[PDB]
Design a protein around this ligand. Structure first.
Ligand SMILES: [Ca+2]
Ligand SMILES: [Ca+2]
Ligand SMILES: [Ca+2]
Ligand code: NA
Ligand code: NA
Lengths: 257, 256
DNA sequence: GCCGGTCGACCGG
DNA sequence: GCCGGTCGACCGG
């Protein structure tokens, strides 16, 4: 990680940073701590200025550093990596229409919140804000499906030393007429036991876990991670197939016969 | 519907309205046109003050005119309807610790945005916002599961005349800073063909469609709508179990 | 004390 | 038309 070494510099400037609350008055979903994510990034941009990039920010530069390139085919080859492309790309149309006049904007679908790149190594940073004023179910981490594919693309293309997926939990609470961070948590996806990783199918097939509680004792290799997770996914997919019928079918069959 | 009769009147007030954008970043999800639901409730309050209630505002009122009744037990009996309870009631410890000094607030998973009650009849209205500046996918209408549960309850209790679930789509487009409502659409769930409803399992098993495109020509009994929906629900469920395997199993089995 | 359901609203490598 | 993932972050009728 490119943040791990300065987690204390970050964690510190965070706790106690009174930030105005959303003018909307819902504090749910994106609006929840959206301003917080911005807060985190802004710091990196000033500390690790050379490695910090917003996912679209990276893209716009990537394309702009190669102006003599056009079309989707050519612009995709600029990733020099299938996996890393499947995680950061935009889509035929969006890619083909890119321009210095029609840049890329933040897309709700984007895999990573912030990108940290250096020495041909990428760190996909996804921050999760958590309202400490209450106790709720584990946040959405990432799509198990998009994770299963990323593993396939890793195994097939043999790319085990290219990127990392790390999370930064930002605990906040309501105080007065504005929000306030009260603590933080960091963890590395590829450092946790894959087999134990929880997949919430209904919840957009997302993996769910509080960063604060994520274990980090995986001693195996990266290749060993992918292959191990992909096995966990399938198993859970099968198990879910059955349970789905046992829960959304059986108890209702007495209304159609 | 207590809204329909004056749809044209609401549709005229909303068009033109504006809402300042948040942190000036990704106006999506709970942070998108969300604020427009606050304008629907407002105008609805001004023209139907005796029937407009935030689902929580309503519950706080119910309990407030029943000082004698305390405890989750009896407090639930205050709904006088299982189904509606499954759709409006709050948690156990929540209804227990309720006091005029600890009222209900906005819950993130509350079935409705607005509740229009009148003469023992309810209208669970769910407002939908949308940036028409782009051809986007259809929004989450409601949990297909929660719906199947609702119908099943409607048949166990014969409650085929008590509530209606309707939707109000409000389209907006960015204009400098604030977002300005440019259009509107209204539609009644229980009028659409319960069999042509699209269940997106990966998307919180939510029913998905754009209000402006929902068909309104069902010509059966409410009892029929339910029976049908459960037949359509149970079917799709089986089909999903099979689709999963061929999409999250076979293409990944080469890896072990 | 183990687990997963719901709301909001997004385009198509 | 039609089909369907994905990011965000929420507690118990
Ligand atoms: Ca995030
Ligand atoms: Ca709504
Ligand atoms: Ca299309
Ligand atoms: Na994520
Ligand atoms: Na809904």
């Amino acid at each position: 990680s490119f943040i791990k070494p300065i987690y204390q510099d970050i964690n510190s400037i965070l706790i106690g940073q009174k930030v105005k609350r959303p003018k909307s008055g819902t504090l749910s979903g994106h609006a929840a701590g959206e301003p917080f994510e911005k807060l985190v990034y802004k710091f990196l941009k000033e500390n690790l200025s050379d490695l910090t990039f917003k996912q679209y920010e990276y893209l716009n530069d990537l394309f702009m550093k190669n102006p003599a390139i056009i079309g989707h085919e050519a612009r995709y080859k600029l990733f020099n990596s299938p996996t890393l492309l499947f995680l950061l790309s935009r889509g035929k149309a969006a890619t083909e229409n890119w321009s210095i006049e029609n840049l890329f904007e933040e897309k709700q679908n984007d895999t990573a919140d912030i990108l940290l790149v250096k020495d041909q190594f990428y760190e996909l940073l996804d921050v999760k804000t958590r309202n400490i004023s209450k106790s709720a179910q584990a946040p959405n981490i990432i799509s198990a499906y998009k994770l299963a594919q990323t593993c396939a693309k890793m195994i097939d293309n043999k790319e085990f030393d290219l990127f990392d997926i790390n999370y930064l939990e930002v605990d906040w609470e309501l105080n007065g007429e504005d929000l306030v961070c009260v603590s933080t948590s960091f963890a590395e996806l590829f450092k946790s036991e894959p087999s134990e990783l929880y997949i919430n199918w209904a919840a957009a097939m997302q993996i769910q876990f509080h960063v604060r509680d994520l274990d980090q004792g995986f001693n195996g290799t990266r290749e060993e991670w992918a292959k191990s997770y992909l096995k966990h996914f399938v198993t859970q997919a099968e198990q879910r197939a059955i349970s789905m019928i046992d829960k959304f079918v059986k108890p209702f069959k007495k209304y159609i016969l």
